[PDB]
Amino acid sequence: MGPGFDFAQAIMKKNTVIARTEKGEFTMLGVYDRVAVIPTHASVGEIIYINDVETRVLDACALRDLTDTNLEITIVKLDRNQKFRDIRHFLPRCEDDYNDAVLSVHTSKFPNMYIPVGQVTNYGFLNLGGTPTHRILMYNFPTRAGQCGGVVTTTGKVIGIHVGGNGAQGFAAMLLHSYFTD
Fold this sequence. Notes:
Interacts with host IFIH1/MDA5; this interaction inhibits host IFIH1. This protein is mainly β. The protein has one helix at residues 3-15, and strands spanning 16-21, 24-32, 35-39, 47-50, 53-64, 70-78, 98-105, 113-128, 131-139, 151-154, 157-165, 170-174. The termini are far apart.
Protein backbone atom coordinates (compact mmCIF):
# COMPACT_ATOMS: atom_id res chain seq x y z
CA MET A 1 0.00 0.00 0.00
CA GLY A 2 3.01 2.34 0.62
CA PRO A 3 6.86 2.38 0.97
CA GLY A 4 6.86 0.47 4.32
CA PHE A 5 4.92 -2.42 2.69
CA ASP A 6 7.18 -2.10 -0.43
CA PHE A 7 10.39 -2.71 1.63
CA ALA A 8 8.66 -5.55 3.63
CA GLN A 9 7.55 -7.26 0.37
CA ALA A 10 11.11 -7.05 -1.15
CA ILE A 11 12.51 -8.86 1.98
CA MET A 12 9.72 -11.51 2.04
CA LYS A 13 9.96 -12.35 -1.71
CA LYS A 14 13.75 -13.08 -1.71
CA ASN A 15 14.92 -13.60 1.92
CA THR A 16 12.29 -15.93 3.61
CA VAL A 17 11.65 -19.69 3.58
CA ILE A 18 9.08 -21.75 5.50
CA ALA A 19 10.93 -23.73 8.25
CA ARG A 20 9.27 -26.76 9.97
CA THR A 21 10.63 -28.31 13.22
CA GLU A 22 8.88 -30.75 15.67
CA LYS A 23 7.61 -27.54 17.42
CA GLY A 24 5.75 -26.14 14.31
CA GLU A 25 5.96 -24.10 11.06
CA PHE A 26 7.88 -20.76 11.30
CA THR A 27 8.73 -17.84 9.06
CA MET A 28 12.57 -18.05 8.64
CA LEU A 29 14.66 -15.00 7.50
CA GLY A 30 17.71 -15.82 5.34
CA VAL A 31 20.47 -13.24 6.04
CA TYR A 32 23.43 -14.21 3.74
CA ASP A 33 24.99 -17.34 2.14
CA ARG A 34 23.24 -20.38 3.78
CA VAL A 35 22.75 -18.56 7.15
CA ALA A 36 19.22 -17.91 8.49
CA VAL A 37 17.55 -17.04 11.85
CA ILE A 38 14.56 -18.53 13.74
CA PRO A 39 13.18 -18.14 17.31
CA THR A 40 15.11 -20.39 19.73
CA HIS A 41 11.80 -22.01 20.96
CA ALA A 42 11.59 -23.64 17.45
CA SER A 43 14.14 -26.18 19.00
CA VAL A 44 16.16 -26.69 15.79
CA GLY A 45 17.77 -30.18 15.58
CA GLU A 46 20.12 -32.02 13.16
CA ILE A 47 17.40 -32.03 10.40
CA ILE A 48 14.84 -29.27 9.51
CA TYR A 49 12.23 -28.95 6.67
CA ILE A 50 12.80 -25.90 4.38
CA ASN A 51 9.82 -25.29 1.97
CA ASP A 52 8.88 -29.00 2.77
CA VAL A 53 12.36 -30.32 1.69
CA GLU A 54 14.41 -32.41 4.20
CA THR A 55 17.55 -30.30 4.99
CA ARG A 56 20.66 -31.12 7.14
CA VAL A 57 21.52 -28.43 9.72
CA LEU A 58 25.30 -27.75 9.39
CA ASP A 59 25.38 -25.56 12.57
CA ALA A 60 22.86 -24.02 15.02
CA CYS A 61 23.72 -21.54 17.78
CA ALA A 62 21.18 -20.24 20.35
CA LEU A 63 22.43 -16.68 21.08
CA ARG A 64 22.82 -15.33 24.65
CA ASP A 65 24.21 -11.95 25.78
CA LEU A 66 27.49 -11.61 27.71
CA THR A 67 25.52 -11.86 31.05
CA ASP A 68 24.44 -15.39 29.79
CA THR A 69 20.80 -14.14 29.26
CA ASN A 70 18.61 -15.67 26.47
CA LEU A 71 18.23 -13.45 23.32
CA GLU A 72 15.66 -15.92 21.68
CA ILE A 73 17.57 -15.90 18.29
CA THR A 74 19.00 -19.13 16.87
CA ILE A 75 21.42 -18.71 13.88
CA VAL A 76 21.13 -21.73 11.59
CA LYS A 77 23.46 -22.71 8.74
CA LEU A 78 21.51 -24.89 6.20
CA ASP A 79 22.92 -27.59 3.87
CA ARG A 80 21.04 -25.91 1.00
CA ASN A 81 22.15 -25.75 -2.67
CA GLN A 82 21.42 -21.99 -3.02
CA LYS A 83 22.54 -18.81 -1.16
CA PHE A 84 20.33 -16.01 0.12
CA ARG A 85 20.67 -12.45 -1.15
CA ASP A 86 23.06 -10.75 1.32
CA ILE A 87 20.89 -8.37 3.43
CA ARG A 88 23.40 -7.67 6.27
CA HIS A 89 23.66 -3.95 5.19
CA PHE A 90 19.92 -3.58 6.20
CA LEU A 91 20.68 -4.64 9.86
CA PRO A 92 20.95 -1.97 12.54
CA ARG A 93 24.27 -1.63 14.40
CA CYS A 94 22.83 -0.61 17.84
CA GLU A 95 19.75 -1.10 20.11
CA ASP A 96 17.09 1.50 19.17
CA ASP A 97 13.40 2.60 19.04
CA TYR A 98 11.65 2.82 15.60
CA ASN A 99 8.62 4.48 14.00
CA ASP A 100 6.14 2.88 11.55
CA ALA A 101 7.21 -0.82 11.49
CA VAL A 102 5.66 -3.74 9.50
CA LEU A 103 5.45 -7.36 10.71
CA SER A 104 5.43 -9.80 7.72
CA VAL A 105 4.63 -13.58 7.94
CA HIS A 106 4.67 -16.29 5.35
CA THR A 107 3.44 -19.80 6.38
CA SER A 108 0.89 -22.44 5.15
CA LYS A 109 -1.55 -20.86 7.76
CA PHE A 110 -0.74 -17.15 6.99
CA PRO A 111 0.55 -16.60 3.39
CA ASN A 112 1.58 -13.09 2.20
CA MET A 113 0.55 -11.53 5.54
CA TYR A 114 1.68 -7.92 6.32
CA ILE A 115 0.69 -6.03 9.55
CA PRO A 116 1.43 -2.33 10.12
CA VAL A 117 2.34 -2.36 13.87
CA GLY A 118 3.29 1.34 14.29
CA GLN A 119 5.77 2.50 16.96
CA VAL A 120 8.38 0.00 18.23
CA THR A 121 9.78 0.50 21.81
CA ASN A 122 13.24 -0.72 22.92
CA TYR A 123 11.56 -2.66 25.79
CA GLY A 124 14.72 -4.51 26.97
CA PHE A 125 13.97 -7.20 29.57
CA LEU A 126 10.98 -9.59 29.11
CA ASN A 127 10.02 -12.75 31.05
CA LEU A 128 9.17 -14.67 27.84
CA GLY A 129 7.31 -17.96 28.54
CA GLY A 130 9.06 -17.97 31.98
CA THR A 131 12.56 -17.38 30.39
CA PRO A 132 14.37 -14.05 31.23
CA THR A 133 15.11 -12.53 27.78
CA HIS A 134 17.03 -9.36 26.75
CA ARG A 135 17.00 -7.01 23.69
CA ILE A 136 13.16 -7.24 23.25
CA LEU A 137 11.35 -4.82 20.91
CA MET A 138 7.64 -4.17 21.72
CA TYR A 139 4.72 -3.03 19.46
CA ASN A 140 1.14 -2.39 20.63
CA PHE A 141 -0.52 -4.96 18.31
CA PRO A 142 -2.41 -8.08 19.50
CA THR A 143 -0.29 -10.58 17.49
CA ARG A 144 -1.38 -14.26 17.87
CA ALA A 145 0.13 -17.81 17.66
CA GLY A 146 1.60 -18.79 14.23
CA GLN A 147 3.36 -15.40 13.59
CA CYS A 148 6.64 -16.47 15.38
CA GLY A 149 9.69 -15.84 13.13
CA GLY A 150 7.75 -13.00 11.41
CA VAL A 151 10.10 -10.28 10.05
CA VAL A 152 9.90 -6.78 11.56
CA THR A 153 11.06 -4.03 9.15
CA THR A 154 11.05 -0.30 8.71
CA THR A 155 11.80 1.55 5.43
CA GLY A 156 15.41 0.52 4.82
CA LYS A 157 15.95 -1.66 7.96
CA VAL A 158 15.35 -5.31 9.06
CA ILE A 159 15.18 -4.84 12.85
CA GLY A 160 13.89 -8.08 14.48
CA ILE A 161 11.97 -11.39 14.39
CA HIS A 162 8.62 -11.86 16.23
CA VAL A 163 9.05 -14.21 19.30
CA GLY A 164 5.84 -13.74 21.40
CA GLY A 165 2.83 -11.75 22.62
CA ASN A 166 0.57 -11.15 25.69
CA GLY A 167 -2.77 -10.79 23.76
CA ALA A 168 -2.42 -6.91 23.58
CA GLN A 169 1.36 -6.41 22.82
CA GLY A 170 3.73 -8.30 20.48
CA PHE A 171 7.47 -8.79 21.10
CA ALA A 172 10.43 -9.27 18.70
CA ALA A 173 14.10 -10.22 19.32
CA MET A 174 16.52 -7.55 17.96
CA LEU A 175 18.67 -8.34 14.95
CA LEU A 176 22.07 -6.59 15.11
CA HIS A 177 24.74 -6.41 12.38
CA SER A 178 27.32 -7.82 14.91
CA TYR A 179 25.49 -11.21 15.06
CA PHE A 180 26.46 -11.96 11.37
CA THR A 181 30.12 -10.83 11.02
CA ASP A 182 31.88 -13.78 9.25
